[PDB]
Design brief:
part of a larger assembly, 5 chains, A: 51 residues, mainly alpha, 2 helices, C: alpha+beta, two-stranded antiparallel sheet, 1 helix, 2 strands, globular, Glutamate receptor ionotropic, NMDA 2A (chain D), Glutamate receptor ionotropic, NMDA 1 (chain E), membrane protein/immune system, Channel, heterotetramer
């Protein structure tokens, strides 16, 4: 996913009017984030803060 | 009223939404604060009786 | 209206609009219909009639 | 010349983006600029090596 | 109406008013059009048309 997003950034698919959506498999450990994930990356994940 | 507007024109003037579509109308005091564009229907005023 | 020059692919304006465009006048006060082709490079005013 | 003869024609062409490649095969500005081509009649102009 | 020997078949199609053409780079625009509106509500234009 990181490679795909980095490659597609140059092509212009991640501008101001695109909303990437991705399952919990790529959300990872919710602590380490590489310098390839654009902001606005809605991704359903299991709860780890509420209870 | 009291040197302030309200509704459509009021929200347009105070940089809140750059558009106003609907049943507006061209006037002389209105056009001095905003800028309309190419009227497309013929309005006016008329009398209706039973 | 707008016509084409003789034996060429260029575009030319004849009559009222051509006279106005070539620095020969500033107002066209006369019966003049509002059209998309005209309004490309002339700033109109609010209409004073409807027909 | 292309710009001045495409704005006078009576057929109505469609000017897309015009691209210049200052440094050939620099893979820092050639790739990003070249990757966005939504056309089919590319009209390059180089000497022989470029 | 004046030469009472003809008729006007049909009602209307492609309606568009007249106007006062001026060049794009002219300072008279913002003061001319407004004036027309100010002259379109105090019965001046209707009176002139009636006359």
């Amino acid at each position: 996913a990181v490679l795909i997003l980095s490659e597609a950034r140059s092509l212009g698919l991640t501008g101001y009017d695109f909303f990437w959506i991705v399952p919990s498999l790529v959300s990872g450990n919710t602590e380490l984030i590489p310098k390839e994930f654009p902001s606005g990356l809605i991704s359903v994940s299991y709860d780890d803060w509420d209870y | 009223v009291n040197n302030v507007w309200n509704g459509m024109i009021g929200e347009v003037v105070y940089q809140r939404a750059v558009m106003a579509v609907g049943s507006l109308t061209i006037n002389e005091e209105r056009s001095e604060v905003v800028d309309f564009s190419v009227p497309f229907v013929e309005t006016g005023i008329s009398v209706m009786v039973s | 209206t707008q016509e084409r020059v003789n034996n060429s692919n260029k575009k030319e304006w004849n009559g009222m609009m051509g006279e106005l465009l070539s620095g020969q006048a500033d107002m066209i006060v006369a019966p003049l219909t509002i059209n998309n082709e005209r309004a490309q490079y002339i700033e109109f005013s609010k209409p004073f009639k409807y027909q | 010349f292309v710009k001045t003869t495409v704005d006078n024609s009576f057929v109505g062409w469609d000017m897309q983006n015009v691209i210049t490649l200052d440094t050939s095969f620099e893979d820092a500005k050639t790739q990003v600029q070249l990757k966005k081509i939504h056309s089919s009649v590319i009209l390059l102009y180089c000497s022989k090596d470029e | 109406s004046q030469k009472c020997d003809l008729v006007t078949t049909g009602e209307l199609f492609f309606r568009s008013g007249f106007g006062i053409g001026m060049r794009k780079d002219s300072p008279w625009k913002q003061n001319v059009s407004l004036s027309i509106l100010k002259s379109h509500e105090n019965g001046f234009m209707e009176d002139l048309d009636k006359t």
